[PDB]
Amino acid sequence: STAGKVIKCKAAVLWELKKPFSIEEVEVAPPKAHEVRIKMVAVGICGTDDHVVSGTMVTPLPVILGHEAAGIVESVGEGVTTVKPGDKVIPLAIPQCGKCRICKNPESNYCLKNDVSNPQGTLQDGTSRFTCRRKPIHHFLGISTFSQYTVVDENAVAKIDAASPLEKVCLIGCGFSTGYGSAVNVAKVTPGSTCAVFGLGGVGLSAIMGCKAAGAARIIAVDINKDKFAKAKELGATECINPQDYKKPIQEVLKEMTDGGVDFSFEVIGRLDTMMASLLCCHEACGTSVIVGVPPDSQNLSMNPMLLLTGRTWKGAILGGFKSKECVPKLVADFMAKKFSLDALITHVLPFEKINEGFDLLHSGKSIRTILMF
Amino acid sequence: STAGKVIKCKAAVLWELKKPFSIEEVEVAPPKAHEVRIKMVAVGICGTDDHVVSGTMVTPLPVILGHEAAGIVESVGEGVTTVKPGDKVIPLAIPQCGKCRICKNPESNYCLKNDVSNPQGTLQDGTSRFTCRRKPIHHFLGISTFSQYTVVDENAVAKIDAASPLEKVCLIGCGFSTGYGSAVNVAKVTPGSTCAVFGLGGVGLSAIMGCKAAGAARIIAVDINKDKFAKAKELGATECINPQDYKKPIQEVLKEMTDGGVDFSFEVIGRLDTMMASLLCCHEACGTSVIVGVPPDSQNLSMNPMLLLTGRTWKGAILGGFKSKECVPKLVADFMAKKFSLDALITHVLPFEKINEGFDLLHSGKSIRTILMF
Numbered sequence: 001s002t003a004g005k006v007i008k009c010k011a012a013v014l015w016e017l018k019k020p021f022s023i024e025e026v027e028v029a030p031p032k033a034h035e036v037r038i039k040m041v042a043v044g045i046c047g048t049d050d051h052v053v054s055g056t057m058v059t060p061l062p063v064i065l066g067h068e069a070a071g072i073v074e075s076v077g078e079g080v081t082t083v084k085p086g087d088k089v090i091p092l093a094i095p096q097c098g099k100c101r102i103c104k105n106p107e108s109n110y111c112l113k114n115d116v117s118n119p120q121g122t123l124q125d126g127t128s129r130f131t132c133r134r135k136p137i138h139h140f141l142g143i144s145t146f147s148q149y150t151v152v153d154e155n156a157v158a159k160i161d162a163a164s165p166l167e168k169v170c171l172i173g174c175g176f177s178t179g180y181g182s183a184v185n186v187a188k189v190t191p192g193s194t195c196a197v198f199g200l201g202g203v204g205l206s207a208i209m210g211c212k213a214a215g216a217a218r219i220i221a222v223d224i225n226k227d228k229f230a231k232a233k234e235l236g237a238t239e240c241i242n243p244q245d246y247k248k249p250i251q252e253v254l255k256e257m258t259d260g261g262v263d264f265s266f267e268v269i270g271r272l273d274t275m276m277a278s279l280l281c282c283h284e285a286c287g288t289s290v291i292v293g294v295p296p297d298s299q300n301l302s303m304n305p306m307l308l309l310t311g312r313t314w315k316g317a318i319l320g321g322f323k324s325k326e327c328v329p330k331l332v333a334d335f336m337a338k339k340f341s342l343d344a345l346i347t348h349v350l351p352f353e354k355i356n357e358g359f360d361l362l363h364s365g366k367s368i369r370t371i372l373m374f
Numbered sequence: 375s376t377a378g379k380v381i382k383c384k385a386a387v388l389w390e391l392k393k394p395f396s397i398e399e400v401e402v403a404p405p406k407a408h409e410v411r412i413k414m415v416a417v418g419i420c421g422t423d424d425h426v427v428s429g430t431m432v433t434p435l436p437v438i439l440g441h442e443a444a445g446i447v448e449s450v451g452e453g454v455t456t457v458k459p460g461d462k463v464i465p466l467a468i469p470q471c472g473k474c475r476i477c478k479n480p481e482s483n484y485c486l487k488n489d490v491s492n493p494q495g496t497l498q499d500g501t502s503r504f505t506c507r508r509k510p511i512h513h514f515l516g517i518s519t520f521s522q523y524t525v526v527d528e529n530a531v532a533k534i535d536a537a538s539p540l541e542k543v544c545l546i547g548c549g550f551s552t553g554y555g556s557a558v559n560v561a562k563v564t565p566g567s568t569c570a571v572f573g574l575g576g577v578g579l580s581a582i583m584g585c586k587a588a589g590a591a592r593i594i595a596v597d598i599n600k601d602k603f604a605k606a607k608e609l610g611a612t613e614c615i616n617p618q619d620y621k622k623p624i625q626e627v628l629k630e631m632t633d634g635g636v637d638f639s640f641e642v643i644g645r646l647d648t649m650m651a652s653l654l655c656c657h658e659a660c661g662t663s664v665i666v667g668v669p670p671d672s673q674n675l676s677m678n679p680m681l682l683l684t685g686r687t688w689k690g691a692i693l694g695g696f697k698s699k700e701c702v703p704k705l706v707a708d709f710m711a712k713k714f715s716l717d718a719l720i721t722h723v724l725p726f727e728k729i730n731e732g733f734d735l736l737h738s739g740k741s742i743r744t745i746l747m748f
């Protein structure tokens with residue numbers, strides 16, 4: 001008898017920047033018209049959540065983060081039609097209202113209802129459903145999945161296969177889809193081409209997978225943490241190199257081993273230097289570089305337009321260019337059909353309450369993707 | 375009678391920066407192995423030529439500029455097979471050696487024998503054929519066409535139709551091709567799309583032509599010089615706007631008149647502010663911005679990677695992505711077949727000796743393209 005009533009559960013709240021998550025008792029208000037309340041089951045730790053912690057990604061505080069999750073619908077608000085109580089769903093970091101210029105554009109996914117452009121830390125109606133210590137807590141990416149119970153908007157949640165292993169498919173909510181899509185959709189890696197992926201975390205590795213599926217001949221993985229090279233090779237990388245083992249700049253290294261540069265480069269870290277390096281390593285006359293990593297807020301790049309005049313294409317994308325609510329269930333369907341494996345990405349599992357340990361694991365470089373089970 | 379002997383003629387020499395061309399007598403050495411000596415007939419004044427004069431584009435001085443021309447082959451050096459004495463030809467500012475990684479890549483045109491990346495001011499063998507005041511004069515883009523006679527490398531000259539009107543087709547050597555190609559090949563303007571073209575010079579207007587040819591629904595021409603608007607509209611622009619007539623940034627203006635941005639934006643001026651505004655005016659989620667205009671040397675752009683993260687493609691090209699030796703004769707064939715008209719581009723004609731007047735016309739904005747006849 002929770003429907004229509006305020007739920008009292010636990011969530012990881014971030015009260016201040018650069019501090020540990022505080023597991024506290026919060027209050028989830030029941031879903032409003034066209035909103036959905038979800039009981040979380042599993043949530044992965046993505047670099048993006050870390051960025052907000054470090055103040056790298058600006059978003060209102062206090063807030064409950066988390067965005068790469070999967071759970072069960074507890075209760076539906078007035079007017080919901082796409083999902084109902086008991087449904088296995090994956091909340092979406094980028095929604096699909098289906099009524100905006102972009103949603104109606106078959107080749108784009110950055111819906112206007114997104115809370116990325118101008119982070120408000122609220123649901124689409126401009127209000128919050130969270131309270132903790134008699135104070136309203138903000139939402140994150142409209143979904144806030146670092147909670148046992150979360151109220152999202154109907155267009156920011158996809159109904160998925162009822163037989164879906166929620167502890168694995170949560171990764172399709174952000175990580176896997178982003179990396180894989182970046183290579184398939186965005187870059188459109190062509191068969192026999194040479195690729196370079198900077199960053200071997202969950203998203204980067206997925207990107208190598210995408211490059212492999214796309215039929216790339218050479219897939220060079222780049223990372224300062226050599227302990228990630230094993231997984232890289234496993235997932236499709238033909239060779240892994242470390243920037244620190246070289247005297248010359250990494251881009252000059254990549255150009256040397258590839259006759260002037262790769263056909264496609266990806267930056268899946270979130271740093272300006274590596275974004276410049278990635279762009280610089282693709283051939284000046286035919287290269288395509290894709291920015292996947294999210295850089296620190298307000299830091300700007302300094303670039304010479306001649307880098308593009310010669311013949312390069314520089315582009316970016318969120319969620320790998322997949323229209324969220326529409327493609328997510330399709331990707332889940334593909335997973336259940338043995339199209340791809342997510343096991344390699346998952347290295348650690350921990351109960352939600354040990355959330356801070358998951359972030360420690362990320363900072364140490366021992367983990368790729370850690371799943372928090374509620 | 376001139377074959378194998380040094381020819382003495384007149385050329386427009388630039389001895390110093392920010393100074394007038396000095397019409398002096400020069401010595402053109404006969405063509406060496408795989409070289410072609412051409413008697414010029416007509417040459418157009420392109421903004422790139424002006425850039426070198428102002429020191430905005432760095433290249434070795436003293437130098438003989440000119441790169442958008444047409445003439446007749448006077449003689450060929452040992453081993454030439456592609457052209458011969460008496461043939462109408464167009465020298466190529468970007469050669470097509472046909473033996474480099476890029477010449478072999480059917481989708482790229484920036485051949486390695488180009489003298490843009492690391493300007494030497496010499497022919498491909500690293501030497502020069504020009505002497506003036508008993509001093510070695512440098513070449514420009516390997517063709518140096520502001521001279522009655524010039525020696526170029528075989529791979530930097532294309533044989534064209536014998537009936538080709540040289541006083542018009544010279545624009546196909548740089549101006550027209552660059553603008554048209556940017557719209558067709560590079561950007562790949564789609565039918566029913568909305569474009570924005572910054573810069574209504576000969577190159578920008580050709581871009582507009584390309585957009586109309588590609589099937590764009592809306593074509594917004596931007597320029598500070600309103601006297602260009604008539605030609606812009608004549609060539610295909612649906613509307614013309616001047617940045618100076620508004621209070622807010624031109625990109626904010628364009629985004630407002632196009633529901634958030636254009637599908638394709640083109641910068642054909644050569645300034646950092648317009649390159650940033652052009653990128654900004656295309657839709658954040660589906661926009662494609664092409665850099666056509668060459669910015670001042672060493673000046674760097676300051677840009678937030680987030681502008682691409684949302685879903686924008688940024689790219690650039692030289693010669694509109696056309697493989698020079700290959701495509702040039704094809705475009706000439708297209709012209710002879712009435713596929714397109716060049717007349718509109720040509721606003722003034724002057725004899726070679728009055729070269730400085732041409733640059734005066736440019737600086738005043740009364741001219742689009744001025745053709746110097748030898």
Ligand SMILES: NC(=O)c1ccc[n+]([C@@H]2O[C@H](COP(=O)([O-])OP(=O)(O)OC[C@H]3O[C@@H](n4cnc5c(N)ncnc54)[C@H](O)[C@@H]3O)[C@@H](O)[C@H]2O)c1
Pocket residue numbers: 045046047048049051174175178198199200201202203204222223224225228243268269270271274291292293294295317318319320362365368
């Ligand atoms: N475009 C998107 O929609 C989208 C989606 C999800 C995540 N992201 C972003 O993608 C980026 C990567 O995410 P992640 O989840 O894979 O996180 P992650 O922290 O686990 O991976 C970072 C990886 O980069 C490596 N690395 C760090 N500095 C390096 C350097 N200087 N040179 C080479 N390698 C270095 C680290 O060792 C680690 O392997 C982050 O910025 C995240 O915010 C973007």
Ligand SMILES: NC(=O)c1ccc[n+]([C@@H]2O[C@H](COP(=O)([O-])OP(=O)(O)OC[C@H]3O[C@@H](n4cnc5c(N)ncnc54)[C@H](O)[C@@H]3O)[C@@H](O)[C@H]2O)c1
Pocket residue numbers: 309419420421422423425548549552572573574575576577578596597598599602617642643644645648665666667668669691692693694736739742
């Ligand atoms: N990529 C290439 O291969 C290639 C080839 C040829 C030329 N170009 C470059 O393209 C650019 C255009 O060449 P062009 O021959 O057509 O030059 P142009 O001087 O004839 O025209 C420049 C145009 O831009 C307009 N303009 C100048 N400042 C402006 C501003 N602040 N806002 C709006 N409009 C402004 C001028 O009024 C003029 O109409 C130059 O940089 C030239 O070097 C590039």
Ligand SMILES: [Zn+2]
Pocket residue numbers: 095096097098099100101102103111112113
């Ligand atoms: Zn939408």
Ligand SMILES: [Zn+2]
Pocket residue numbers: 046047048049067068174175
């Ligand atoms: Zn994420």
Ligand SMILES: [Zn+2]
Pocket residue numbers: 420421422423441442548549
């Ligand atoms: Zn030019």
Ligand SMILES: [Zn+2]
Pocket residue numbers: 469470471472473474475476477485486487
């Ligand atoms: Zn070549």
